RNA sequence: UCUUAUAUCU
């Protein structure tokens, strides 16, 4: 493929087949910008036993620093307004985003996603597993909600709110489902015509933020990054969210290796100590950029872990 | 196959 | 002379341009000519899941004598136009308040409550936005002129300190660029009313990105925010939640039309407006059913689009639509 | 270069060599957008006496209307939490943005930066001067901070915040340093893959906002536009802030002329009086756009004054 | 005449 | 040298 | 790889 640039081609690689190489090729987004950046390749490997007779919901969202968001519910049900998704961080979070709700941008200021994958590698033997895996994607964007509050001068509140989480409550005609033992592999893709830099947000530990009701936010349910010294919502990139629903009957022993990948381009702060690891985003690769979009529209919602 | 061997083929399709 | 027919529809070389490419320009500058809307999507770089909504309004409208009626065709998903009239010879004042007229299928699409707006669609992006006024008056009793101009009204924020005992600082939504409605813009179209008009808008950005759905906005300025605080020249009320609302603000210059009927005028017209949107459908929504992929990059459709729009008069008379 | 377009060539000229033409050739950005626009060619010339035994920090940020932000500190010291950068406007601000915090868009609604250059031309004599000039660019962006206040009905607050100002706290690894009497000329470049329009913001005089601790904003310091009839922060462009640190030892007699250029494309409002001066943005010039990026890439972070 | 008629002609002119 | 003199050189080489 | 719906164009 002697039309693609060295990096145009590494892009495609990191983008769609991370697990197929000894070490991650990814080397930045071959678009027009060629500013100073630091490409970070977050990987999370996790041994996990899906709780029996429950429906585990995993969300692979474009929230820098956190690998996935999980929650479980009574089998056959979906997250209700009372449900809270908890965050599972990729290694190195604090080293990257601090440990205070308002120190998110000490090291880095903005970021853009170049990749986001997930794979489930069943580990149970042929006599113990039972359940299925279902995947679907959803355009959840981070918008705002404006509502009058009854303070004294008498205000009007404008706060952050996730829009599109409503599509978590149902498996659409565009899904992948199959026996748990088969495992899965999936990728997300840029949900915008271009690849722009997203700003780092400050002080979001939970969404809806505290002292705002779910119902006010308009979110079907809520996401909590938890304690500020442990994790946080530092942003929300331009990728569709990947919904994974693991289902397991009682008596089943369903275990797997959860693996997540996310390649991103960060704008290093000259004061940050990760700066000297920086580089320039690579030059425009018209062919890679095109081939990216068509390959994207050509793949299935997901595939079994045997072809990954 | 493999995902890169699947991807590689797609690219070879519309590059041809 | 006399009045132009009314476009009826759905009644049962140029080769360099891709198929979806052509259908895009067609919908973008002249929808009234086709029996059916050719539109499929925006032939740009994005090839994701979208449902291309085709909004059309057929609105009977009487322009009341001895007033200037102001019509705003703004990129607010679900509502076709914002109207208001003032004393003849004047413009909107802080006191003025534009009420919204919806495209059919609003609640079906955006719900019946202010925080229910993104239950089925998470974001959108305009492909086209056109207006057409077809006068239905007799050539003996009409009077007045029609004037079109376009403003680059964008949706920003207003940061202002409040007198809350812990004591705070506010940030609320505010329309920037609305003072444009306050004067006939130099680049405008003006003609006898009994001649109608038909004008269009184009994307006001070098590309076509997705705007997010906005929750809980009914009036703008929002309640408990005065019109002086927000720094706006007037208001935009969408009414009751159950009725309408402002669910977003796309990247299209808003079109301003001012009808001006002197006293003793009998001015009535058929208002028709078209807007083609590309939405991001939610797996839980039924429209999800009708989703398709946005068409692929048509570099020629995309450049031609830019040049055609720049070669067209700000407005044209009906007869020539 | 007659492979390039006329308007395309100018774009490059204003973008990189403003001081070289007997008249600003810049005539708009040669990208896809071709709508109405008035171009503003902001130039500020200012004699400046750097205080001795102090490090003076200048910031050329993409805030329409103000030429730069200044502040000084104890020599060999960086700005602390209690520091306050003060705005210095380009001539004719009130004419473009009024004299009231919520009356910034009467004339203009939007704007995009075509260029932003800075120049220091020392005027001290070769026996009194002492010290140096150090330049580094930072990717500061205007983001938001969310924090629960304690008002009675009790609310969650969302307010403007600058992310990436922590970069002003150290000399960036990529920088220009040299004798004071050698002067400097530096230029900034768009910090996004493209050139999108940015909105005019209302009611902003100080970031951190009023009635907000520098500590909750998560900002290392405080940017003050000052009195609303004088200046204001009307928007945050997509260019890296050029940070200049002049540094006069004790007994130094350091004086210069601080020139500062910024060429913009605004969206004139039909009611504005500057409207009749507008034209259309020049049409796409793929070459101009491409070379804009590589030129930017092959230039030093800054150059001594005699090389501009 | 029509808007599309005019648009069509314009497109043709620009393409050639 | 001057600036333009610097950017011209560059630009001439990336077009050859 | 030919017949069938339909949408396209000089
Ligand atoms: Ca863009
Ligand atoms: Ca909802
Ligand atoms: Ca954008
Ligand atoms: Ca105003
Ligand atoms: Ca900070």
Spatial CA neighbour of A133 closest among A223, A254, A18: A254
Q: Report the protein residue whose CA lies nearest the C1' of nucleotide G7.
A: C38
Distances in whole angstroms, Cα of residue D280 to Cα of each of A93, C306, D38, D39, D275: 47, 11, 8, 10, 12
Whole-number Å distance, CA C12 to C1' G4? 22
Other C-beta atoms lying within 10 Å of the C-beta of residue D299: 17
Return the number of CB contacts < 8 Å for C and D.
Answer: 146
Strand partners, A119: A185, A259
Nucleotide nearest to C14 (CA to C1'): G9
**Helix-then-strand count for chain B, H and E:** 1, 0
The DSSP secondary structure of chain A, one letter per residue, reads: --SS-HHHHHHHHHHH-GGGSSS-------SS---EEEEEEEEEEEEEEPPTTEEEEEEE---TTEEEEEEEEETT----TT-EEEEEEPTTHHHHH-SSTT-TTSSEEEEEEEEEEEEEEE---TTT---EEEEEEE--EEEEEEE----SS---EEEEEEESGGGGSS--SS-EEEEGGG-EEEE--B-SSS---EEPPBSBSEESPSSS-HHHHT-SSEEE---TTT--B----SBPEEEEEEEE-TT---EEEEEEEEEEEEEE-TTSTTGGG-EEPPPP-HHHHHHHHHHHHHS-S-B-TT--
Residue of D nearest to C252 (CA): D35
Which of chain G's bases lie under 7 Å from a protein CB? Answer: 7-10
Distances in whole angstroms, Cα of residue D258 to Cα of each of C46, C138, D261, D280: 45, 68, 10, 32
C-alpha to C-alpha distance for A166 and A162, rounded to whole angstroms: 9
Spatial CA neighbour of A146 closest among C77, C211, C174, D160: C174
C-alpha to C-alpha distance for A262 and C13, rounded to whole angstroms: 46
Other C-beta atoms lying within 10 Å of the C-beta of residue A213: 13
Contact D196, D112 (CB under 8 A): yes
Distances in whole angstroms, Cα of residue D154 to Cα of each of A213, A226, D213: 12, 21, 18
Catalytic residue chosen out of the listed positions A20, A42, A280, A285: A20
Spatial CA neighbour of C177 closest among C197, C214, C212, C151: C151
Chains C/D: 3 or more C-beta pairs closer than 8 A? yes
- The residues, ordered by sequence, that sit 6+ positions from C12 with a Cβ below 8 Å of its Cβ are none
Can you give the three-state secondary structure of chain C, one letter per residue?
CCCCCCCCCCCCCCCCCCHHHHHHHHHHHCHHHCCCCCCCCCCCCCCCEEEEEEEEEEEEEEECCCEEEEEEECCCCCEEEEEEEEECCCCCCCCCEEEEEECCCHHHHHCCCCCCCCCCEEEEEEEEEEEEEEECCCCCCCCCEEEEEEECCEEEEEEEECCCCCCCEEEEEEEECHHHHHCCCCCCEEEEHHHCEEEECCECCCCCCCEECCECCCEECCCCCCCCCCCCCCEEECCCCCCCCCCCCCCECEEEEEEEECCCCCEEEEEEEEEEEEEEECCCCCHHHHCEECCCCCHHHHHHHHHHHHCCCCCECHHHC
Measured between CB atoms, which of D154, D163, D167 is closest to A200?
D163
On chain F, the residues whose CB falls within 8 A of the CB of D185 are 3
Residue C33 a catalytic site member:
yes
- Looking at residue D78, the DSSP 8-state letter turns out to be -
What is the SS3 assignment for D182?
helix
Whole-number Å distance, CA A293 to C1' G6? 28
Distances in whole angstroms, Cα of residue A213 to Cα of each of A171, A206, D150: 26, 12, 16
Sheet holding D206-207, edge to edge: D176-179, D132-138, D241-248, D54-60, D66-74, D84-89, D222-224, D206-207
Can you give the three-state secondary structure of D272-283, one letter per residue?
CCCHHHCEECCC
List, as ranges, residues with CB under 5 A of the ion ligand 4: C 231
Nucleotide nearest to E4 (CA to C1'): G9
The structure tokens 């640190």 sit at D245
Q: Does C303 touch chain D (CB under 8 A)?
A: yes
**Quick check: C321 and E3 CB within 8 A?**
yes
C-alpha to C-alpha distance for C122 and C210, rounded to whole angstroms: 10
Pair of tokens at residue D288? 């101009």
Using the CB atoms, write b or e for A2-16: b if 16+ within 10 Å: eebbebbbbbbbbbb
Distances in whole angstroms, Cα of residue A228 to Cα of each of A65, A90, A99, A203, C306: 13, 15, 6, 8, 48
Spatial CA neighbour of B10 closest among A295, C3, D54: A295
Pair of tokens at residue D158? 């969302």
Contact C301, C24 (CB under 8 A): yes
Residues in B lying within 8 Å of A, measured between beta carbons? 1-8, 10-12, 14-15
C-alpha to C-alpha distance for D243 and D85, rounded to whole angstroms: 12
Strand partners, A18: none
On chain C, the residues whose CB falls within 8 A of the CB of A161 are 215
- Looking at residue D290, the DSSP 8-state letter turns out to be H
C-alpha to C-alpha distance for D282 and A69, rounded to whole angstroms: 46
Nucleotide nearest to C35 (CA to C1'): G7
C-alpha to C-alpha distance for F9 and F5, rounded to whole angstroms: 6
Other C-beta atoms lying within 10 Å of the C-beta of residue A28: 24
C-alpha to C-alpha distance for F7 and D4, rounded to whole angstroms: 14
Using the CB atoms, write b or e for C295-305: b if 16+ within 10 Å: bbbbebbbbbb
Q: Does D52 touch chain A (CB under 8 A)?
A: no
Pair of tokens at residue B7? 């991807």
Contact D299, D182 (CB under 8 A): no
Pair of tokens at residue D123? 């005027």
Other C-beta atoms lying within 10 Å of the C-beta of residue A34: 20
Residue D175 burial (10 A CB sphere; 0-12, 13-18, 19+): middle
Distances in whole angstroms, Cα of residue C210 to Cα of each of C27, C116, C251, D98, D148: 19, 19, 9, 32, 30
Measured between CB atoms, which of C45, C209, C217 is closest to A293?
C45
The structure tokens 């006599």 sit at A127
Per DSSP bridges, beta strands C189-192 and C145-151 are antiparallel
Contact C29, E3 (CB under 8 A): yes
Residue of D nearest to F6 (CA): D299
C-alpha to C-alpha distance for A22 and A13, rounded to whole angstroms: 12
What is the SS3 assignment for D129?
coil
Whole-number Å distance, CA C18 to C1' G8? 10
C-alpha to C-alpha distance for D22 and A98, rounded to whole angstroms: 50
Separation of CA C306 and ligand 4 centre (Å): 30
State how far Cα D1 lies from the chain centre. 30
Which residues of D sit in the known binding site for Ca(2+)?
A: 106, 166, 194, 196, 218
Contact A93, A40 (CB under 8 A): no
Cα torsion through A210, A212, A217, A222, rounded to 10: 40
**Quick check: B14 and A19 CB within 8 A?**
no
- Alpha-helical runs (H) found in chain D: 6-16, 93-97, 214-217, 286-297
Q: Does D158 touch chain C (CB under 8 A)?
A: yes
Spatial CA neighbour of A186 closest among A135, A237, A111: A135
Half-sphere exposure of C197 (CA within 13 A, CB side): 24
Per DSSP bridges, beta strands A84-89 and A222-224 are parallel
Pair of tokens at residue A131? 């359940």
Main-chain phi, psi angles of A88, to 5 degrees:
-120, 110
On chain D, the residues whose CB falls within 8 A of the CB of F12 are 1
- Alpha-helical runs (H) found in D153-306: 214-217, 286-297
Measured between CB atoms, which of D32, D36, D102 is closest to C229?
D102
Residue of D nearest to C206 (CA): D33
C-alpha to C-alpha distance for D90 and D61, rounded to whole angstroms: 13
| CB < 7 A contacts with chain G (nucleic strand) | C 13-15, 19, 22, 38; E 8
Max intra-chain CA distance, chain A: 67
Minimal C-alpha gap between C211 and chain A (Å): 9
Contact D74, D96 (CB under 8 A): no
Other C-beta atoms lying within 10 Å of the C-beta of residue A126: 6
Residue of C nearest to E3 (CA): C321
Contact C77, C124 (CB under 8 A): yes
Spatial CA neighbour of A211 closest among D151, C165, C168: D151
**Quick check: D20 and F4 CB within 8 A?**
yes
Contact C265, C245 (CB under 8 A): no
Residue of F5, F7, F14, F15 to mutate, interface with D, max D Cβ within 10 Å: F7
- Looking at residue B9, the DSSP 8-state letter turns out to be H
Minimal C-alpha gap between A21 and chain B (Å): 9
Separation of CA C98 and ligand 2 centre (Å): 27
C-alpha to C-alpha distance for C131 and C32, rounded to whole angstroms: 10
Spatial CA neighbour of C180 closest among C154, C200, C206: C154
Distances in whole angstroms, Cα of residue D221 to Cα of each of D62, D82, D101, D224: 18, 6, 22, 10
Return the number of CB contacts < 8 Å for A and D.
Answer: 144
Pair of tokens at residue D274? 């500057």
Residue C39 burial (10 A CB sphere; 0-12, 13-18, 19+): buried
Spatial CA neighbour of A157 closest among D235, D29, D158, C61: D158
On chain C, the residues whose CB falls within 8 A of the CB of E7 are 25-26, 29-30, 308, 312
C94-99: long-range contacts (C-beta < 8 A, 24 or more apart)?
C94/C227, C94/C228, C94/C233, C94/C234, C95/C234, C96/C233, C96/C234, C96/C235, C97/C234, C97/C235, C97/C236, C97/C237, C98/C70, C98/C72, C98/C234, C98/C235, C98/C236, C98/C237, C99/C237, C99/C238, C99/C239
C-alpha to C-alpha distance for C311 and D133, rounded to whole angstroms: 50
Whole-number Å distance, CA A242 to C1' G1? 41
Other chains touching E, judged by 3 or more CB pairs under 8 Å:
C
Q: Does D298 touch chain A (CB under 8 A)?
A: no
- Looking at residue D22, the DSSP 8-state letter turns out to be S
Residue ranges and CATH numbers for the domains of chain D are 1-308 (2.60.120.20)
- The residues, ordered by sequence, that sit 6+ positions from C313 with a Cβ below 8 Å of its Cβ are C189
CB proximity under 8 Å: C 94-153 to D: 149-153
C-alpha to C-alpha distance for D206 and D66, rounded to whole angstroms: 13
């Amino acid at each position: 493929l002697t039309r693609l640039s060295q990096p145009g081609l590494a892009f495609l690689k990191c983008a769609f087949a991370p697990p197929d190489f000894n070490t991650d090729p990814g080397k930045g987004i071959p678009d027009r910008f060629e500013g100073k950046v630091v490409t970070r390749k977050d990987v999370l490997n996790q041994s996990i036993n899906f709780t029996a007779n429950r429906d585990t919901f995993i969300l692979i969202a474009p929230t820098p620093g956190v690998a996935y968001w999980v929650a479980d519910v009574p089998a056959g049900t979906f997250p209700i307004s009372t449900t809270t998704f908890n965050a599972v961080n990729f290694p190195g979070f604090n080293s990257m985003f601090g440990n205070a709700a308002a120190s998110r941008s000490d090291q880095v200021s903005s970021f853009r996603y170049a990749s986001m994958n997930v794979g489930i590698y069943p580990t149970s033997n042929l006599m113990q597993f039972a359940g299925s895996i279902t995947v679907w994607k959803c355009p959840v964007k981070l918008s705002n909600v404006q509502f009058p509050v009854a303070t004294t001068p008498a205000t009007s509140a404008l706060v952050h709110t996730l829009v599109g989480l409503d599509g978590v409550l149902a498996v659409g005609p565009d899904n992948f489902s199959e026996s748990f033992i088969k495992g899965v592999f999936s990728q997300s893709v840029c949900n915008e015509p271009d690849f722009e830099f997203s700003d780092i947000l400050e002080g979001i530990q939970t969404l809806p933020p505290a002292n705002v009701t779910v119902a006010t936010s308009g979110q079907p349910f809520n996401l909590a990054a938890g304690a500020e010294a442990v994790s946080g919502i530092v942003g929300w990139g331009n990728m569709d969210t990947i919904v994974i629903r693991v289902s397991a009957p009682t008596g089943a022993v369903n275990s797997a290796i959860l693996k997540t990948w996310a390649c991103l381009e960060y704008r290093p702060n000259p004061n940050a100590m990760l700066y000297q690891f920086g580089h320039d985003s690579p030059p425009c690769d018209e062919v890679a950029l095109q081939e990216y979009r068509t390959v994207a529209r050509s793949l299935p919602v997901a595939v079994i872990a045997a072809q990954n | 196959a493999s995902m890169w061997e699947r991807v590689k083929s797609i690219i070879k399709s519309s590059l041809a």
